[PDB]
Amino acid sequence: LMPWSWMVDWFGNVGTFLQASNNTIGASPGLVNIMTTTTTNHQFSVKRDLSDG
């Protein structure tokens, strides 16, 4: 009752794949994005020497 055929097929496939590559999967890069947030604060203090009393 052993599943010989499945074992043969999958072992052959995995063996040929491993030998095709070298224990690695290739990859490629998608687009590169850059985000640049910028902020500033403008604070004031009243000068009382040039104002009506």
Partner: protein, 122 residues
């Protein structure tokens, strides 16, 4: 009836022709066969009538199938291809209308439609 030899023109109109031959007939069924060096071809036709239930509509079923077999070579095991249709209708119905429905189903099917359908496009 249907003759002794059944011809399937693989590839639609103008394709390669094969001649199946009648080999057996049992149980309102008939199967035709053709040996090949590396594959095998077969066709079956079947008719059936459902069980009677006290007060309900009585129905009958017709089935036709084509199945293809490819012998295992090297690592690859055995595998097959199949394609079959079915017709269901009332016992006393009118033949022309169900024939028109079947012809409509047949006409809808064409190369481009199988091409889309096999691409898992619903």
């Amino acid at each position: 009836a249907l003759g002794d030899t059944l011809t399937i023109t693989l590839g639609g109109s103008g394709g390669t022709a094969k001649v199946l031959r009648k080999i057996n007939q049992d149980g309102y069924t008939s199967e035709y066969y053709l040996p090949e060096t590396s594959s095998s071809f077969r066709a079956k036709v079947r008719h059936t009538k459902e069980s009677v239930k006290p007060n309900q509509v009585q129905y009958e079923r017709h089935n036709v199938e084509f199945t293809e077999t490819v012998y295992a070579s090297g690592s690859t095991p055995e595998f097959v291809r199949q394609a079959y249709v079915v017709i269901r209708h009332k016992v006393g119905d009118v033949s022309a209308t169900v024939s028109d429905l079947g012809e409509a189903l047949s006409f809808y099917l064409n190369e481009a439609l199988y091409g889309k359908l096999i691409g898992w496009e619903s």
